[PDB]
């Protein structure tokens, strides 16, 4: 178990410093393309929802004593179609309790790419409307998709993600569910960088495990 001080790189396409962040909303992909599935076995994988690029990574111990890099999580592949394209170097799952029987899970993955690949994904973003007086408004997800191309570079870090809503809890959760429409998404530490791309050189240090 390490602490990962991520240094955010420049926004990845189609994002940019001055436009809302785009995230691969549904679990499917356009024809002739595949989603980025972080897979342990065929019965356990977490599709990619919010993709990010990390310029540099600084590992540490739990007490922040300087440490060296960790070995890749064994048995874990970031397979796109059947073939692997990256190695997973950390994992972390934020379990938020929306309501007593409504839980929001936001898994994270810091994966290094071994083979450059490009995919097209249905993308969307988080929109919050306007409400008169003091009425509550939900940080929703635009149900209107928009196919776009995402490019991943060889030997470059990336902070993949996944978000899900689970009703009714397992005692790590391998539940992959789309980003719903008309469902409020309370912000958590693993989702703060998916409302608008952060500037380059912005550091976000995380508590990321190295095992399930």
């Amino acid at each position, epitope marked *: 178990e390490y602490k990962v001080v991520l240094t955010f790189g420049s926004p990845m396409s189609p994002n940019a410093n001055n436009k809302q962040t785009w995230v691969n909303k549904p679990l499917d992909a356009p024809s002739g393309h595949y989603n980025v599935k972080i897979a342990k076995d065929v019965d356990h994988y977490l599709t990619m929802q919010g993709f990010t690029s990390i310029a540099s990574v600084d590992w540490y111990t739990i007490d922040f004593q300087p440490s060296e890099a960790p070995a*890749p999580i*064994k048995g874990l592949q970031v397979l796109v179609n059947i073939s692997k394209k990256a190695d997973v170097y950390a994992v972390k799952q934020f379990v938020t309790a929306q309501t007593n029987n409504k839980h929001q899970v936001t898994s994270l993955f810091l994966v290094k790419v071994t083979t450059g690949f490009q995919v097209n994904n249905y993308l969307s973003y988080f929109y919050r409307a306007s409400a008169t007086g003091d009425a509550t408004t939900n940080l929703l997800v635009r149900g209107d998709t928009y196919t776009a191309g995402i490019s991943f570079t060889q030997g470059g870090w990336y902070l993949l993600t996944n978000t899900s809503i689970v009703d009714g809890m397992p005692p790590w959760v391998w539940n992959n569910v789309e980003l719903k429409t008309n469902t409020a998404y309370h912000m958590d530490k693993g989702l703060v960088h998916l409302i608008m791309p952060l500037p380059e050189s912005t550091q976000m240090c995380y508590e990321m495990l190295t095992s399930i």
Partner: antibody, heavy 119, light 103 residues
Framework: QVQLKESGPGLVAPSQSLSISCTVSGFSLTTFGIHWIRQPPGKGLEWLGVIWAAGTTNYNSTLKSRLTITKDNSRSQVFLKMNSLQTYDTAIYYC?????????????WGQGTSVTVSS | AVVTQESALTTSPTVTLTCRSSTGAVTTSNYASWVQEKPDHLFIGLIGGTNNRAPGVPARFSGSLIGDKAALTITGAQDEAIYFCALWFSNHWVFGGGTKLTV
């Protein structure tokens, strides 16, 4: 078929850098890690280092200061740099492929280059 | 961490080799593995992850965990060589002293 071959100087004087390039064949260098296992004379194996498929290299900790493993995917040639050599470092050197995704163990072993250090 | 193995063993045409650990009980998190060494330093992988068998290995080889030591059991041995067990210690494999199997 999967193969692994090793080429080494065969004789190096003390304090002279050791350069060995285990040019794997038959398996891509970006999916399976390459370890460096040295078998001293009449002794059990000892771990040296590994260069993972995403390029993160992990050294044996005792030999971290000197050992340095690099790799060239295009030519599929992993390199080992050993500085400040010593007499006791003589041993047959292996490069070993690790399937850390499916099998998790060291599958195939290299022929080995006998590095002799003497006067 | 130190992985200690028996120096010698004998059998005729099953044997059990124990890969003892000097830290604590051997678990699946250690990803045990066995590599048989033949004459002329011919190495090969015969067991990985304590359950997975390397490609081409005969079906007579089988591994598992017994007590606090990882062991590999040979059924119907026909294999006379030195057997090395290596246990992953979360950063780097550690290698046991050779079994020195006899047939």
């Amino acid at each position: 078929q999967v193969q692994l071959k090793e080429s080494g100087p065969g004789l190096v004087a003390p304090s002279q850098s050791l350069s060995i390039s285990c040019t794997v064949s038959g398996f891509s260098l970006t999916t399976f890690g390459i370890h460096w296992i040295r078998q001293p004379p009449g002794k059990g194996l000892e771990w040296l280092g590994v260069i993972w498929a995403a390029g993160t290299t992990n050294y044996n900790s005792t030999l971290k200061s000197r050992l340095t493993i690099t790799k060239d995917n295009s030519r599929s040639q992993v390199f080992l740099k050993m500085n400040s050599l010593q007499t006791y470092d003589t041993a047959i050197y292996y490069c070993v492929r690790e399937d850390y995704d499916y099998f998790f163990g060291l599958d195939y072993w290299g022929q080995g280059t006998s590095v002799t250090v003497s006067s | 961490a130190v992985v200690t193995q028996e120096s010698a063993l004998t059998t005729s045409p099953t044997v059990t080799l124990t890969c003892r650990s000097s830290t604590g009980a051997v678990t699946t998190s250690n990803y045990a593995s066995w590599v048989q060494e033949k004459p002329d330093h011919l190495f090969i992988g015969l067991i990985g992850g304590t359950n997975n068998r390397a490609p081409g290995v005969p079906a007579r080889f089988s591994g598992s965990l017994i007590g606090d030591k990882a062991a590999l059991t040979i059924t119907g041995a026909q294999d006379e060589a030195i057997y090395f067990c290596a246990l992953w210690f979360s950063n780097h494999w550690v290698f046991g002293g050779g079994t020195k199997l006899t047939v």
